[PDB]
């Protein structure tokens, strides 16, 4: 949040600035939104607002050939352990289906199994 | 049973083989379809041989071949080949599905060759083996008796040839329904037929059917003139009524033409039958002088409105919050609006000295709103706050100007001359606080002025304001210019001002062209999709904002289906909170042909997160249903009025307070907790500062004029929409960032009544009316069914749905014309046998002249 | 007649309807990982 | 989106002072209930409206 001085020319004494209100409130905590238009003078409450253009959008779009070789570096060493990687997966699914049958969960397997589908679609992306 | 028999005739050479084997076929087809599909290749190479002359019957079968296998493409061709041999009245299921399937080839293949010619019909360019077929049906129609489905085929067909044909062979004499019937090709070249060519063709049409009848409704006749928005033929019915001049003739098209008319249209009337002669007495009523004058006297006489109203509400919040004097100056113009009360603002003194600069711009200007409806003594009231006259300070100044403007909107020929010369002095020599001031009131008023006017003079003076660099007097030039485009507008204006905008550092100038250019573009529909692609996409937020307001105003009325597309899109992927709550209150423009279906969008959007949207859907039923009103918009803006957020309760508050205007016991039940809550939130004091905001405006709204007025932006007679009323709800729909932008609903007060004239004096009478809404049942708030009949004079109040029943009494000697439409307004009487005058009511008018 | 051209135009409601709820709930999985992320 | 209109409006329920813990002992005709909590004293309340 800003504060903003007094230079007046459009104020003297008191009078009525800061056009163009919408958006949001006072907010601040406590005093400061105590006076607002009878003590402008040292305090009152502002807005922040920020101007971007078209080329300034792209700046920082950039962190998505370099990075095709560094997509490939952790497929590379999952070919090592590809047999050890997916039997670690059935294993854990294997313990989360007899979880359903003692309710007589979801959850727990939902989230392991998402995990192995993503994995499997990168592989297929190496070929 | 197998086709192979039949068919292997087919092979040899002889005259009764080749026509034994395919007459054999046709008797049987659903039996035998299946193995001839793969004789096809078969049947079809005897229709290319010239010596073979059964090919009509034998492309008949082939037709049935596509027919059986579900596809009617090639199923119509072959069919047409059979000529004689395709029997029109067998009326099976194969000459009753083919025949209709050939229609709507015929609509497609229509509307695709519209656009390169119109005269596709006449011409060979469309095949005339589906024309023959077509014309079939249109005569068999007409053994039946319907006029609607042989008029209604031809209208999404694009052909003029039948609807000449058959309507003015229908024509007997008696006349009056074959003037519905035309009526009706009125109505359905709107909502069937979205094209504006078409559209306008018809009622170049239809004008000539009812002048080539001697009977013929006059209504119906601006009713046609107003839709083509065409001054020629509007001079074919002066002319017309000049020798048949009657009580209730030429006075009735003069007093209709004021609102329906756009202001191009008025500037052709009084110039073209000044040349030719013209009424000397009817002179004032084509510029709309005494329209104003009549409502006058209804407004002061019959004011219904409280003292204790606006005294409560002012005298709750004083000094400290000044943010609360706008809306003291909000609640008392409404109210007083046209009855010319200034005696508010001197009987509190202490609430005209705790009033800043900008809080005395809004009470000065407070006077055009109530004293509007008075153009003789609208500058003579206000002459101390007009320049000239030294006051305490220059934002006093400015606000008279702006007032100024709001008295004569549309009538400012008079103060053009004063305003014009007091920019253009200003023009050369600015960059001071002061002289800004006056430069900032001068183009606010010039804007009302000159609304609709064409004069560039206008346009270039405020164009060179915004270049001297001043973001203080640059936000009216931007809104001033806005008015003067409105309608077709200038080309050249489209380009300047959008390219001006981006190269500019000013806030508030750049908000006020993007406001600015949806008010060039007006009506163009399709026309205005050069600017619309431009500024939906630049990626400013400024820009995009006045972007979605393009095309409220160009598909206002009548729109289409890709027009809420495009206002969907923008509101959804764009983050700007502004732009997406500016998409969601354009979809009320769009939506002003039906007001029941507008809810049912409302309903899905008003549920959403990002709460400015939540308020722009809220005002999307305050734009459209507020000229009806419908009991299902009052539970979709339940839920927001008990929203914690503090300016969604602004926009839930001022809603219901357009569309609850005059209802009471008997009509609306609910608004009698609506009501109560508008007083609740200025007597509770626990409440945030913009929540006591709304409420001040709410009930300013309803108690408006003293409840005699009403807000609408359309009635039905010519089937258009006001020019004042819509673009000044554009205004008020904006109350975010100037406050008092409410005065601008001035505009759009519609008050309901019915003035009698009486044609032979051209005064008004006073006698009773019969009528079946009797205070028991139908009545108003002061401070269904029907049985028993009820009598009231004129100049009174009379509610939209009171206006089914009223009737003239006769026994007066009053002959009514127009009679009872539905609806308020006007309505020009006659005289049986004049002898002496009867009775006589006095308006501001006697005073005057 | 003037029945059978209405079915037409609640064909292009529930097209504007259908349109705009397939466009706001995909919009509302961008707006459903940033709400859970900030709180 | 109600999910979504619920968490963002938790910040308004995160910034609730919370609630106590006590046990109840004895009540009396005032709908006055006497309120033990164990880490502080006893603190004699108003039940609820709806309760």
């Given at each position: ?7 007046t020319?459009?104020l003297i004494?008191?009078?009525?600035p800061?056009?163009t209100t919408?958006?949001?409130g006072?907010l601040n ?5 105590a006076?607002?238009?009878?003590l402008?003078?040292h305090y ?5 607002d920020?101007?971007?253009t078209?080329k300034e ?7 998505h ?6 997509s490939?570096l952790?497929?590379?060493?999952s070919?090592v352990?590809?047999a ?5 997966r059935?294993?854990?699914?294997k ?5 359903e049958?003692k309710?007589?969960?979801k959850?727990?397997?939902?989230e392991?199994?998402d ?8 592989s297929?992306?190496?070929? | 049973?197998?086709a ?6 087919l092979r040899?050479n002889?005259?009764?083989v080749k026509?034994y084997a395919?007459?054999?076929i046709?008797?049987?087809?659903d039996?035998?379809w ?14 290319d ?11 008949l079968?082939?037709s049935k071949?596509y027919?059986?296998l579900?596809?009617y493409?090639?199923?119509v061709?072959?069919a047409?080949?059979?000529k004689?041999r395709?029997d029109?009245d067998?009326?099976s299921?194969?000459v009753?599905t083919?025949?209709?399937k ?6 497609q293949?229509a ?5 390169k010619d119109?005269?596709?019909?006449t011409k060979d360019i469309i095949?005339p083996?589906?024309?023959s ?6 005569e068999?129609?007409?053994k ?5 489905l042989?008029?209604?085929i ?6 003029l040839?039948?609807?000449?044909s058959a309507?003015?062979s ?8 074959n003037?519905k ?11 069937t037929?979205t094209?504006?060519?078409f ?6 049409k239809?004008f000539d059917?009812?002048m ?7 209504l119906?006749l601006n ?7 065409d001054?020629?033929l ?11 001049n009657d009580?209730g ?22 110039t073209?039958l ?5 009424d ?7 510029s709309?002088?005494?329209?104003c ?12 409105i409280?003292?204790g109203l606006?005294?409560k ?7 400290k919050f000044?943010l ?5 100056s909000?609640?008392n ?9 200034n005696?508010f603002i001197?009987?509190?003194?202490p609430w005209l000295?705790?009033?800043q600069?900008?809080?005395?711009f809004?009470?000065?200007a407070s006077?055009?709103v109530?004293?509007?409806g ?8 206000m002459?101390?706050?007009?320049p000239g006259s030294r ?6 100044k400015?606000?008279?100007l702006?007032?100024?403007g709001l ?15 007091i ?6 020599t ?5 002289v800004?001031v006056?430069?900032h009131?001068?183009?606010?008023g010039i804007?009302?002025?000159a ?7 206008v346009?270039e ?10 973001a203080?007097?640059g ?13 077709t507008?200038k080309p ?7 390219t001006?905008?981006?190269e ?6 750049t908000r006020g062209?993007?406001?600015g250019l949806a008010?060039?573009?007006?009506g163009?529909?399709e ?7 431009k500024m ?5 937020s ?10 409220a105003?160009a598909?206002?009325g ?7 597309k495009?206002?969907?899109?923008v509101?959804v992927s764009?983050?700007?909170?502004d732009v997406?709550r500016?998409?969601?209150?354009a979809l009320?423009?769009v939506?002003l042909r ?6 049912r969008?409302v309903?899905l959007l008003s549920?959403s997160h990002?709460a400015?949207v939540?308020?722009?859907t809220?005002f999307a039923?305050?734009?459209a249903?507020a000229?009806?009103?419908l009991?299902?918009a009052?539970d ?10 503090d300016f969604?309760?602004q926009?839930?508050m001022?809603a219901l ?7 009471t ?9 609506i009501?109560?809550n508008?007083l609740?939130?200025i007597?509770?004091?626990?409440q ?13 709204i309803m108690?408006?004029?003293?409840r005699?007025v009403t807000?609408?932006?359309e009635?039905a007679?010519?089937?258009t929409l006001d020019?004042?009323?819509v673009?000044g709800?554009?205004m008020?729909?904006?109350?975010w ?9 001035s505009?759009s007060?519609?008050?309901t009544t019915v ?5 032979s ?11 079946y ?8 708030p002061?401070?269904?069914?029907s049985?028993?009949?009820?009598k ?12 089914r ?7 007066d000697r009053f002959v009514p014309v127009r009679?009872f ?7 020009v009487?006659?005289?049986?046998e004049?002898?002496e005058?009867?009775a ?7 005073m005057k002249? | 007649?003037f ?6 135009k609640?064909?292009e409601?529930?097209?504007?309807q259908?349109?705009y709820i397939?466009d706001?709930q995909?919009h ?11 709180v | ?20 813990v006590?046990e109840v ?5 005032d709908?006055?209930?006497?309120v033990?909590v164990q880490?502080?004293?006893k603190?004699?309340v108003?039940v609820?409206?709806?309760?």
């Amino acid at each position: 949040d800003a504060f903003r001085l007094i230079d007046t020319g459009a104020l003297i004494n008191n009078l009525e600035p800061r056009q163009t209100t919408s958006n949001t409130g006072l907010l601040n905590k406590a005093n400061i939104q105590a006076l607002i238009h009878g003590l402008n003078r040292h305090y009152y409450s502002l807005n922040i607002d920020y101007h971007k253009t078209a080329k300034e959008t792209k700046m920082l779009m950039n962190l998505h050939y370099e990075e095709k070789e560094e997509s490939n570096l952790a497929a590379t060493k999952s070919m090592v352990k590809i047999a050890e990687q997916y039997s670690k997966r059935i294993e854990e699914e294997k313990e989360l289906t007899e979880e359903e049958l003692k309710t007589r969960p979801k959850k727990h397997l939902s989230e392991t199994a998402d995990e192995t589908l993503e994995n499997n679609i990168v592989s297929v992306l190496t070929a | 049973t197998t086709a192979a028999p039949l068919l292997a005739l087919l092979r040899e050479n002889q005259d009764s083989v080749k026509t034994y084997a395919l007459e054999s076929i046709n008797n049987v087809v659903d039996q035998l379809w299946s193995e001839i599909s793969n004789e096809l290749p078969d049947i079809e190479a005897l229709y290319d041989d010239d010596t073979f002359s059964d090919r009509e019957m034998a492309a008949l079968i082939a037709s049935k071949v596509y027919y059986n296998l579900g596809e009617y493409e090639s199923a119509v061709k072959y069919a047409l080949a059979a000529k004689d041999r395709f029997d029109i009245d067998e009326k099976s299921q194969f000459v009753e599905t083919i025949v209709s399937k050939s229609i709507e080839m015929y609509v497609q293949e229509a509307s695709k060759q519209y656009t390169k010619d119109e005269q596709f019909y006449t011409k060979d360019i469309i095949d005339p083996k589906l024309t023959s077929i077509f014309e079939r049906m249109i005569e068999k129609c007409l053994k039946a008796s319907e006029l609607k489905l042989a008029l209604g085929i031809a209208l999404e067909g694009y052909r003029l040839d039948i609807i000449e044909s058959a309507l003015k062979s229908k024509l007997d004499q008696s006349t009056s329904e074959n003037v519905k019937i035309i009526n009706y090709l009125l109505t359905l070249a709107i909502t069937t037929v979205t094209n504006s060519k078409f559209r306008s063709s018809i009622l170049r049409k239809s004008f000539d059917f009812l002048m080539n009848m001697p009977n013929c409704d006059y209504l119906t006749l601006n009713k046609v003139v107003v839709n083509l928005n065409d001054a020629g033929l509007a001079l074919q019915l002066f002319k017309k009524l000049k020798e048949e001049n009657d009580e209730g003739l030429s006075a009735q098209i003069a007093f209709d033409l004021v609102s329906s008319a756009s202001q191009q249209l008025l500037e052709i009337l009084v110039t073209e039958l000044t040349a030719q002669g013209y009424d000397p007495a009817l002179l004032n009523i084509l510029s709309g002088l005494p329209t104003c004058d009549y409502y006058n006297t209804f407004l002061l006489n019959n004011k219904n409105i409280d003292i204790g109203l606006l005294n409560k509400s002012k005298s709750s919040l004083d000094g400290k919050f000044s943010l609360f004097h706008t809306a003291v100056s909000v609640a008392n113009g409404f109210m007083h609006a046209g009855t010319t009360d200034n005696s508010f603002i001197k009987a509190n003194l202490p609430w005209l000295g705790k009033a800043q600069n900008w809080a005395k711009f809004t009470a000065t200007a407070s006077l055009g709103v109530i004293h509007k409806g008075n153009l003789l003594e609208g500058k003579k009231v206000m002459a101390p706050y007009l320049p000239g006259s030294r006051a305490s300070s220059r934002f006093i100044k400015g606000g008279s100007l702006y007032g100024l403007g709001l008295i004569y909107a549309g009538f400012g020929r008079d103060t053009t001359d004063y305003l014009k010369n007091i920019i253009v002095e200003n023009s050369g020599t600015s960059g001071d606080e002061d002289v800004d001031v006056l430069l900032h009131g001068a183009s606010l008023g010039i804007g009302l002025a000159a609304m609709g006017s064409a004069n560039i003079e206008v346009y270039e003076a405020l164009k060179e304001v915004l270049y001297n660099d001043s973001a203080t007097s640059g936000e009216a030039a931007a809104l001033g210019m806005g008015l003067c485009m409105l309608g077709t507008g200038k080309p050249e204006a489209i380009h300047d001002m959008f390219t001006y905008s981006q190269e500019t550092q000013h806030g508030n100038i750049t908000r006020g062209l993007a406001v600015g250019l949806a008010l060039i573009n007006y009506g163009r529909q399709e026309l205005a999709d050069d600017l619309i692609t431009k500024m939906l996409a630049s990626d400013e937020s400024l820009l995009r904002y006045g972007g979605a307001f393009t095309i409220a105003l160009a598909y206002a009325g009548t729109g289409n289906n890709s027009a809420v597309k495009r206002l969907l899109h923008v509101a959804v992927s764009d983050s700007n909170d502004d732009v997406r709550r500016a998409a969601v209150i354009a979809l009320g423009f769009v939506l002003l042909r039906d007001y029941t279906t507008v809810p049912r969008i409302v309903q899905l959007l008003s549920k959403s997160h990002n709460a400015h949207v939540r308020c722009g859907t809220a005002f999307a039923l305050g734009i459209a249903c507020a000229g009806k009103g419908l009991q299902s918009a009052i539970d979709v803006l339940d839920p927001l009025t008990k929203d914690p957020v503090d300016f969604v309760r602004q926009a839930a508050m001022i809603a219901l307070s357009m569309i609850l205007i005059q209802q009471t016991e008997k009509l609306n039940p609910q608004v009698a907790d609506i009501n109560k809550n508008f007083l609740s939130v200025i007597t509770n004091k626990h409440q945030e500062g913009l929540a006591k905001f709304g409420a001040c405006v709410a009930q300013g709204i309803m108690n408006a004029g003293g409840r005699n007025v009403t807000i609408q932006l359309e009635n039905a007679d010519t089937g258009t929409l006001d020019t004042k009323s819509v673009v000044g709800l554009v205004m008020f729909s904006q109350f975010w960032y100037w406050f008092p932008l409410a005065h601008f609903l001035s505009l759009s007060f519609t008050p309901t009544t019915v003035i009698g004239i009486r044609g032979s004096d051209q005064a008004i009478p006073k006698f009773q009316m019969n009528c079946y809404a009797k205070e028991d049942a139908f009545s108003y708030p002061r401070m269904k069914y029907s049985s028993k009949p009820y009598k009231v004079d004129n100049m009174t109040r009379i509610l939209p749905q009171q206006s089914r029943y009223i009737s003239f009494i006769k026994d007066d000697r009053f002959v009514p014309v127009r009679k009872f439409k539905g609806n308020n307004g006007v309505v020009v009487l006659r005289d049986r046998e004049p002898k002496e005058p009867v009775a006589l009511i006095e308006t501001v008018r006697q005073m005057k002249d | 007649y003037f029945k059978l051209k209405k079915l037409e135009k609640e064909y292009e409601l529930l097209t504007l309807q259908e349109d705009y709820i397939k466009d706001e709930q995909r919009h509302l999985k961008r707006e459903l990982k940033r709400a859970q992320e900030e709180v | 989106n109600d999910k979504v209109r619920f968490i963002k409006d938790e910040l308004r329920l995160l910034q609730e002072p919370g609630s106590y813990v006590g046990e109840v002992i004895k009540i009396v005709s005032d709908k006055k209930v006497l309120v033990k909590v164990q880490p502080e004293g006893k603190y004699i309340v108003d039940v609820a409206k709806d309760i």
